[PDB]
Amino acid sequence: KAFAKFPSSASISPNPFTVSIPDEQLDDLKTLVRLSKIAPPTYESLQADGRFGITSEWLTTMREKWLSEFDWRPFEARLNSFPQFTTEIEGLTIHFAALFSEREDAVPIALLHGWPGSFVEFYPILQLFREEYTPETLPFHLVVPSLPGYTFSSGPPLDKDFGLMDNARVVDQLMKDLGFGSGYIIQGGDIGSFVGRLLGVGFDACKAVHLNFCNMSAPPSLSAAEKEGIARMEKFMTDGYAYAMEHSTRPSTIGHVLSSSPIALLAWIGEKYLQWVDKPLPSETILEMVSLYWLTESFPRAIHTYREWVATPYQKELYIHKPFGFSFFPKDLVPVPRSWIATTGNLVFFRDHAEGGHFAALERPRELKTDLTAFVEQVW
Amino acid sequence: KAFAKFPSSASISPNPFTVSIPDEQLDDLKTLVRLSKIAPPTYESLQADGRFGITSEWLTTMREKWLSEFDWRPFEARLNSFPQFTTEIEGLTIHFAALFSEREDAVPIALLHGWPGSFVEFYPILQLFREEYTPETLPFHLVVPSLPGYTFSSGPPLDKDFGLMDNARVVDQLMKDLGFGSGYIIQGGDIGSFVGRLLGVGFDACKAVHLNFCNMSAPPEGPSIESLSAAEKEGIARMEKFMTDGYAYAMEHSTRPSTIGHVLSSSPIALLAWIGEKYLQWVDKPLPSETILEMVSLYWLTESFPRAIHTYREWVPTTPYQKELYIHKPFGFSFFPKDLVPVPRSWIATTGNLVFFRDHAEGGHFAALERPRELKTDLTAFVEQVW
């Protein structure tokens, strides 16, 4: 009960989902955390500024915390605190969390995660809505899908390639399944932003798009603050992008590498949870997200989009003609200015923020929630 | 005993080295191979052509082979079949294999490996020399160092940065210590080529350089791509594909050596996947699976990977080749068509006094392993011409 009732217009039946990881799997994870090896200290791993990636000190400390302090059960209970479901789309099990309104006039919204995130990223925002409204007063339907290849969603297929457009098709079908064929809005960050762009461009039921991320180069006058943002983008694309190039070019190899040991996964993904935020996340949060990826074998399956994600498409064929909104966080990965973003769509809404990094839903949930709400109010 | 006598002009003491990996460490390796997981099958890992990297089938099969077939001891015995030594240079333990001549007129040569190689890559060539000469007749001194950070060499330092010039200085010091201050020749491939270039450019004791690899990009003042033969254009096409589809590993080594060092140190299967991909993709004819397991096990047991990649942050960035890094000394090149970045003769010629060039119809990146006879023959001809 509570926010779990499917809209009357839904053409699918509710199949409630509960996260229940067997003790054996948790025992196995713990054994592999302990028996995984740690690299000998090197000049690079002894750099306190972490300019070469995660330090020996950080990895050692996190390993110890994972073994002695981390408990999966309370996090799992939190996962299960919100309505979750699965439905089958093109032979894929598509997982989603949701808060459904009882209002007939509620605006449907799907909120789309990226890598190395998941549906969990949006739990703080869902919690804010749940605190502030009843099912009778909730102004929106809030759908948080697990994209193909992530966590409790299966896929992508083994027998054919799968890309960004395929991801968009699945999200659009899910929204139609839930009864939102008459119209929905998309909120997207990271890879979810590109999926959101494709929904805005190519799918009629998508009526508007709000993004908190746009990776673009100079479009075919700038303030010092804007130039700083461009400098950060350039550093990310030149010094911070090797992981993405590996995902793009050799997904099978890196998939196997990070599946081999949970310490491998922690190092690779943990680096990004450290570097990509404004204010440091709790170490517990990093362990939760990494453990979630480990236990669902997310990494090797989720990275399929990189070979497409990594010419002026945004100003032409991928221009968002529908109402387009943007939330700018200064410590995001590629903080391009408003004037650049405006060339990529019908930008009718732009929110600037003084603080916050890449994981906006985790770092600045109140700002992202209120920005999104304001955008919907303006355009719907 | 044979070929193990230091030259009379050597200043340092011979400290014979024997590879003797404790049983406990071999047991630890097999435990961690067994404990290691593999990815669930994916579209990418089921591609027979391996265009997305190592396949599920290959990794599964290699893991089983590593557990049920592989024995370190015969390989270790092969390692110990040639003279090996260590010496200390700048506080680093520098390991090297060698065949020393008893001839006073013997030409000193150091042969330089790269990544993910090691001194072992030159063993087939050392074997050919030992089969064909006695210490009394061997025309060359053949020194095969382990570069700082690889296998039985220690380093690089924990308390300061270390780069390509530092590597060059270590190699030059080793050759001087062994008595070759009056002159030596460098043979290099991969990262060793760039070390060799620096030796040719800035070290007086280095008298000539032979390379089988050049990391250069297109020369600004020509010759143009249009001037190249159809075959040479194909080479540029391969080089370009390598630099754009094949180079992500190098970018990770350069930008995030600490992260990737920890990642591959965590599990021997992680190391096998990352390095094995290159032993699969970079060769002409496939190597025996046993060879891949030997090389990966060697890296694992010596914690090579996190230490060896220090050079990438300097090597990846690399008109320097035509100007400041031009080799003015006699410069030779051996071209293998399935190497990573097969730039043509007319491009290589802009980067040094290229007095010697040899093409080959076959062979990939690991020239010393793949085409030892050809590389040995080229080196010998080069020395005869220039020394």
Topology:
2 copies of one chain form a homodimer.
Chain A: H1 23-35, H2 56-68, H3 72-79, E1 84-89, E2 92-99, E3 107-112, H4 123-132, E4 140-145, H5 164-177, E5 184-188, H6 191-202, E6 206-211, H7 224-239, H8 242-249, H9 251-259, H10 262-275, H11 283-295, H12 298-302, H13 306-309, E7 320-328, H14 338-341, E8 345-352, H15 360-363, H16 365-379
Parallel strand pairs in A: 3-4, 3-5, 5-6, 6-7, 7-8
Antiparallel strand pairs in A: 1-2, 2-4
Helix pairs in contact in A: 5-6, 8-9, 10-11
Could you give a short description of this structure?
2 copies of one chain form a homodimer. By secondary structure, the first copy, chain A, is an alpha/beta fold.
Structure overview:
In chain A, strand 3 (107-112), helix 4 (123-132) and strand 4 form a beta-alpha-beta unit. Chain A has helices at 23-35, 56-68, 72-79, 123-132, 164-177, 191-202, 224-239, 242-249, 251-259, 262-275, 283-295, 298-302, 306-309, 338-341, 360-363, 365-379; strands spanning 84-89, 92-99, 107-112, 140-145, 184-188, 206-211, 320-328, 345-352. The first copy, chain A, has a single domain, classed as 3-Layer(aba) Sandwich (Rossmann fold), CATH 3.40.50.1820. The longest helix of chain A is centred in the middle third of the chain and has 16 residues, at 224-239. Chain A is of the alpha/beta class and 380 residues long. The first copy, chain A, is globular and about 60 Å long. The first copy, chain A, has 16 helices and eight strands. An eight-stranded mixed sheet of chain A has the order 1-2-4-3-5-6-7-8, sandwiched between helices. In chain A, helix 10 (262-275) packs across helix 11. Chain A is 43% helix and 14% strand. At the A-B interface, helix 1, helix 8, helix 9, helix 10 and helix 12 of A face helix 1, helix 8, helix 9 and helix 10 of B. Chain B: The active site is at 190 (nucleophile), 312 (proton donor), 365 (proton donor). Chain B: GO terms for molecular function: epoxide hydrolase activity.
